[PDB]
Amino acid sequence: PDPMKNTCKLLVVADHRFYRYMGRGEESTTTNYLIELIDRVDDIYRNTAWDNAGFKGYGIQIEQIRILKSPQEVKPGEKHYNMAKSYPNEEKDAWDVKMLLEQFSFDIAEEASKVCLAHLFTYQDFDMGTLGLAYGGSPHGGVCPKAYYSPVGKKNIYLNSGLTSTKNYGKTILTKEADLVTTHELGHNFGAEHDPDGLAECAPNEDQGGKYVMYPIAVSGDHENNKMFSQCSKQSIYKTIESKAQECFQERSN
Ligand SMILES: CC(C)C[C@H](CC(=O)NO)C(=O)N[C@H](C(=O)N[C@@H](C)C(=O)NCCN)C(C)(C)C
Ligand SMILES: [Zn+2]
Numbered sequence: 001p002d003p004m005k006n007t008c009k010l011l012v013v014a015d016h017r018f019y020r021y022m023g024r025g026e027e028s029t030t031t032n033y034l035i036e037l038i039d040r041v042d043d044i045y046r047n048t049a050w051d052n053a054g055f056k057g058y059g060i061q062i063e064q065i066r067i068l069k070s071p072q073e074v075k076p077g078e079k080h081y082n083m084a085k086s087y088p089n090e091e092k093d094a095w096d097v098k099m100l101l102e103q104f105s106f107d108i109a110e111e112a113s114k115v116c117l118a119h120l121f122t123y124q125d126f127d128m129g130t131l132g133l134a135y136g137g138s139p140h141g142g143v144c145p146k147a148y149y150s151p152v153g154k155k156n157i158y159l160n161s162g163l164t165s166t167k168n169y170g171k172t173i174l175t176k177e178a179d180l181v182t183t184h185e186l187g188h189n190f191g192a193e194h195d196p197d198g199l200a201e202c203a204p205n206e207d208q209g210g211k212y213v214m215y216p217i218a219v220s221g222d223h224e225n226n227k228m229f230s231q232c233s234k235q236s237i238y239k240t241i242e243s244k245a246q247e248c249f250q251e252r253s254n
Helices: 018-020 027-046 099-108 176-190 232-247
Strands: 007-014 059-067 117-122 132-134 147-148 155-158 159-163
Touching: 007 018, 007 027, 018 059, 018 117, 027 059, 059 232, 099 117, 099 132, 099 159, 117 176, 132 176
Parallel strands: 007 059, 007 117, 117 159
Antiparallel strands: 132 159, 147 155
């Protein structure tokens, strides 16, 4: 490992929904929630030995927290990830999750080009229990901005993005649950795919510690393995870090 290239700096964005519902309409409350969450997530990553030996000390740190205190004003027919209404159905509490991730990536493109990852934190009830979405680790995108020319958007957007909502089924998720969602979405950014049932090593039974963080289902969160990465995730992320650290990782701060 290269201590001068072992940290993925993040642009963290709190939309107006997050500001109001999680942040109590305050910069301090909003930021303190995110600072602490990212730090707990960083503990998982930083202590992980990707090759099961010395390849460790790789993690994440916040470069900037953008705080959107009010909805984004838009013209008719125009959309923005921070606009007041949900899209495509304004009668729903939330956007279609995939469309939101794409919109966020479009709107945040110039800023995203300057950081390892950009992550949106919002407060909306996605349909059917969905909690987050991210590019990378999909059967592209992930760490370090990679351009994608959007025919619809008419400009380059970058696929180094993901999002977490802290609302599910009409209530605020537990902080221990939020940590897991963000760890999982950034896991995809870092190159991990979902742990498949067919590999017991990567998807253990409850008596053996339970599932690892990259399992595709989220329920409970009280088992030992739940907060950690499986050997399958480690192998994928290891390869990702090896190819990407020199490209956009930086020295750990503080
Ligand atoms: C951190 C979790 C695992 C993220 C995934 C989606 C995903 O793979 N993000 O990369 C999720 O939202 N999973 C949901 C989930 O398990 N949600 C739980 C909290 C839930 O609401 N379960 C009840 C739904 N009948 C799905 C999509 C499986 C319904
Ligand atoms: Zn996933």
